[PDB]
Ligand binder design. Structure first.
Ligand SMILES: CNc1nc(NCc2ncccn2)c2c(-c3ccc4ncccc4c3)c[nH]c2n1
Length: 347
């Protein structure tokens, strides 16, 4: 899979390595599990612990991503300190080191992302019982971070991995097709390179677009509650199998929000420094442009996404709504979220 795509695709910063290579006379590379902006994640055998398998994030040699990693490490240090028993539901770091100039970090081996599984299943949504379990663990995992003055900032299905993504095959007679279904819905949360402590500096722009919260877009300053926005977007995505906010433009994104959730409140509209997006207390957006038609055509009021009318489904959307409250101050906290009716069945 490590084919050069272009003349611009030199091994720029990329570590030169081949399967079989040994790192620090300990870690033998077996496969490449993924790629990213930061570099690569490979599967390794830990020969110093009886051949257990691990995942090894290997960072490019570029100063931008080196610093991100430094921050990722020290967060994970802080995390293993506050919970040496590793029941938190965030991923577990084991080790970290330099090799040939590139930083490496050693995590427990997990399965595919909730995204990947979903994509590999033709976006066939998760059944509600699994949505509940995944949502629960997601909220637990992040509550933990919030309790310790942390915000993740970049939650999304790519950063929520299954412990074990082994799956049962069930053909559908009722609808004619193949349909997977994961055995164990246990998950863990990964990627702490962007995660931020309350006292540290806050980057102006923070989540992955589709999961980004209005306070961020409007540059009103953010903190713990923007994680919750993202979580709501994720939980929605799990229920219907596609992204709530499929756009790449702030104005359009704000439009979609309005269409889906109702109008943006005025406090936010006066108090933002991004006044280009508004006019006389409303979003400066024409619904009859082709953009305007696209928005109205391809998304709709939140509750029109409900399939069944069973009580448990209504509890889900109660939860989602509360999580997608426009004002961070009023938006549901994860404490409050874990107590919600929807989750009563667990605890
Ligand atoms: C399939 N087994 C597995 N895979 C993993 N990574 C899959 C992957 N990562 C990045 C890009 C593409 N694919 C991991 C990680 C880990 C650590 C850091 C991360 N940082 C940002 C994004 C994801 C990350 C995943 C921990 N345990 C794992 N087990």
């Amino acid at each position: 899979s490590r084919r050069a795509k272009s003349v611009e695709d030199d091994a720029e910063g990329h570590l030169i390595y081949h399967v079989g290579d040994w790192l620090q006379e300990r870690y033998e590379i077996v496969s490449t599990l993924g790629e990213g902006t930061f570099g690569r994640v490979v599967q390794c055998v830990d020969h110093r612990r009886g051949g257990a398998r691990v995942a090894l994030k290997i960072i490019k040699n570029v100063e931008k991503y080196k610093e991100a990693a430094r921050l990722e490490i020290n967060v994970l240090e802080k995390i293993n300190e506050k919970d040496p028993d590793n029941k938190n539901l965030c991923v577990q770091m084991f080790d970290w080191f330099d090799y040939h100039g590139h930083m490496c970090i050693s995590f427990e081996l997990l399965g595919l992302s909730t995204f990947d599984f979903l994509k590999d299943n033709n976006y066939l949504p998760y059944p509600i019982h699994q949505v509940r379990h995944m949502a629960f663990q997601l909220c637990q995992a992040v509550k933990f971070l919030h309790d310790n003055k942390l915000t993740h900032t970049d939650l999304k299905p790519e950063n929520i991995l299954f412990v074990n993504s082994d799956y049962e095959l069930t053909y559908n007679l009722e609808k004619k097709r193949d349909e997977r279904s994961v055995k164990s819905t246990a998950v863990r949360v990964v990627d702490f390179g962007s995660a931020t402590f309350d006292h540290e500096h806050h980057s102006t722009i923070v989540s992955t677009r589709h999961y980004r919260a209005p306070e961020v877009i409007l540059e009103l300053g953010w903190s713990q509650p923007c994680d919750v926005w993202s979580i709501g977007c994720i939980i929605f995505e799990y229920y219907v199998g596609f992204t709530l906010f499929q756009t790449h433009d702030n104005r359009e994104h704000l439009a979609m929000m309005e269409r889906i959730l109702g109008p943006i409140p005025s406090r936010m509209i006066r108090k933002t420094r991004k006044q280009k997006y508004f006019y006389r207390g409303r979003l400066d957006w024409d619904e009859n442009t082709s953009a305007g038609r696209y928005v109205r055509e391809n998304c709709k009021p939140l509750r029109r996404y409900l399939t069944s009318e069973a009580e448990e489904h209504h509890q889900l959307f109660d939860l989602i709504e509360s999580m997608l409250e426009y004002e961070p101050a009023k938006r549901l906290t994860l404490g409050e979220a874990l107590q919600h009716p929807f989750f009563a069945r667990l605890r």
